[PDB]
């Protein structure tokens, strides 16, 4: 068995590597990459996803969400405070701010010591979600407005066309804005390309481990697990590495940097932090792999959830029986 110790994994492909974005994934999980959770891709020293990253300023963040945390420094929820729009520009000045700022550090574990203490008292400002791409068309290389659609994988896999569209999204972050512990939806996989700026930490728990985290999570947060099965669907729960260490969940840790790729991969939990002032772009995909994971997925159907258009034919094609409440849940 590759990587049986479920180490995150680092690969450097060639440009002729490069070339066929599906048979690459496939090779990283020859190599047993997926029993991370999370791998690596660093580009082609030849590659580039666009030409320039100087006229973005005039981008709009319609729907700014300041991070505000409840609980303790290790173990706390964060909810999601709607701002009032504004570029790309005036988001990079605000975060260049000194109530923003990144603070004087010495390297990376500095930084996340200073994360995992101090997170809390602050209420960060993350432009997520944003639909839209900065790979330039002529990118022909892994650019994630070109990908293989999930619907296509669907139907290829399994015969039965369905509606739906899958489309990236762009996400501005700033010092200490922060990514909840999830899976993607319908446990797909997820590509992200950080396209400038700081660094990206990120945490992640091997998918065969996966329902260790989630006893964890049902201990540390239980009001919120008598209120939902599926409640990290919500993406609002936070438990630091030392807390996952003195309870024995397994986990790995890496730090992305601008010019890096991250693939997560079927039902591996993550959650992580912005260094200060960044742009990164990401979508869901699927592989013939998946659809095993898709089928087996948990759901929320509590009403809190709240997704895509698409994700309805992936329940009812998938999930026959749960699809009646489920939708119920989205409406
Ligand atoms: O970058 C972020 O805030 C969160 N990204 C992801 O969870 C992802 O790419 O799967
Ligand atoms: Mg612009
Ligand atoms: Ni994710
Ligand atoms: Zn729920």
Same mark, same amino acid.
């Given at each position: 068995?590759?990587?049986?110790? !479920?180490?995150?994994?680092?690969?450097?492909?060639?440009?002729?590597?490069?070339?066929?974005?599906?048979?690459?994934?496939?090779?990283?999980?020859?190599?047993?990459?997926?029993?991370?959770?999370?791998?690596?891709?660093?580009?082609?020293?030849?590659?580039?996803?666009?030409?320039?990253?100087?006229?973005?300023?005039?981008?709009?963040?319609?729907?700014?969400?300041?991070?505000?945390?409840?609980?303790?420094?290790?173990?706390?929820?964060?909810?999601?405070?709607?701002?009032?729009?504004?570029?790309?520009?005036?988001?990079?000045?605000?975060?260049?701010?000194?109530?923003?700022?990144?603070?004087?550090?010495?390297?990376?574990?500095?930084?996340?010591?200073?994360?995992?203490?101090?997170?809390?008292?602050?209420?960060?400002?993350?432009?997520?979600?944003?639909?839209?791409? $900065?790979?330039?068309?002529?990118?022909?290389?892994?650019?994630?407005?070109? $990908?293989?659609?999930?619907?296509?994988? $669907?139907?290829?896999? !399994?015969?039965?066309?369905?509606?739906?569209?899958?489309?990236?999204?762009?996400?501005?972050?700033?010092?200490?804005?922060?990514?909840?512990?999830?899976?993607?939806?319908?446990?797909?996989?997820?590509?992200?390309?950080?396209?400038?700026?700081?660094?990206?930490?990120?945490?992640?728990?091997?998918?065969?481990?996966?329902?260790? $985290?989630?006893?964890?999570?049902?201990?540390?947060?239980?009001?919120?697990? =008598?209120?939902?099965?599926?409640?990290?669907?919500?993406?609002?729960?936070?438990?630091?590495?030392?807390?996952?260490?003195?309870?024995?969940?397994?986990?790995? =840790?890496?730090?992305?940097?601008?010019?890096?790729?991250?693939?997560?991969?079927?039902?591996?939990?993550?959650?992580?932090?912005?260094?200060?002032?960044?742009?990164?772009?990401?979508?869901?995909?699927?592989?013939?792999?998946?659809?095993?994971?898709?089928?087996?997925?948990?759901? !929320?159907? !509590?009403?809190?959830?709240?997704?895509?258009?698409?994700?309805?034919?992936?329940?009812?094609?998938?999930?026959?029986?749960?699809?009646?409440?489920?939708?119920?849940?989205?409406?």
């Amino acid at each position: 068995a590759q990587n049986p110790n !479920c180490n995150i994994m680092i690969f450097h492909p060639t440009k002729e590597e490069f070339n066929d974005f599906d048979k690459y994934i496939a090779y990283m999980e020859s190599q047993g990459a997926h029993r991370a959770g999370l791998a690596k891709i660093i580009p082609p020293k030849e590659w580039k996803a666009r030409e320039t990253y100087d006229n973005i300023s005039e981008i709009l963040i319609a729907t700014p969400l300041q991070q505000v945390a409840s609980g303790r420094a290790g173990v706390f929820t964060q909810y999601h405070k709607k701002k009032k729009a504004m570029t790309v520009g005036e988001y990079r000045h605000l975060a260049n701010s000194k109530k923003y700022q990144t603070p004087p550090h010495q390297n990376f574990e500095d930084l996340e010591r200073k994360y995992w203490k101090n997170r809390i008292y602050n209420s960060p400002i993350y432009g997520a979600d944003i639909s839209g791409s $900065l790979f330039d068309e002529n990118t022909k290389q892994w650019n994630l407005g070109h $990908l293989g659609t999930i619907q296509d994988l $669907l139907e290829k896999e !399994c015969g039965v066309v369905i509606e739906g569209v899958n489309t990236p999204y762009l996400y501005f972050g700033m010092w200490k804005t922060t990514f909840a512990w999830h899976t993607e939806d319908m446990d797909l996989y997820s590509i992200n390309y950080l396209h400038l700026g700081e660094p990206k930490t990120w945490y992640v728990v091997p998918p065969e481990h996966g329902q260790r $985290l989630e006893r964890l999570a049902r201990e540390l947060f239980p009001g919120s697990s =008598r209120g939902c099965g599926a409640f990290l669907r919500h993406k609002v729960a936070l438990i630091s590495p030392t807390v996952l260490k003195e309870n024995g969940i397994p986990f790995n =840790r890496i730090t992305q940097e601008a010019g890096e790729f991250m693939v997560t991969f079927p039902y591996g939990y993550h959650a992580g932090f912005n260094h200060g002032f960044n742009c990164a772009e990401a979508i869901n995909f699927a592989t013939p792999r998946w659809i095993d994971y898709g089928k087996m997925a948990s759901q !929320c159907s !509590c009403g809190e959830a709240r997704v895509t258009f698409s994700m309805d034919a992936f329940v009812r094609i998938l999930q026959p029986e749960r699809y009646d409440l489920w939708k119920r849940g989205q409406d």
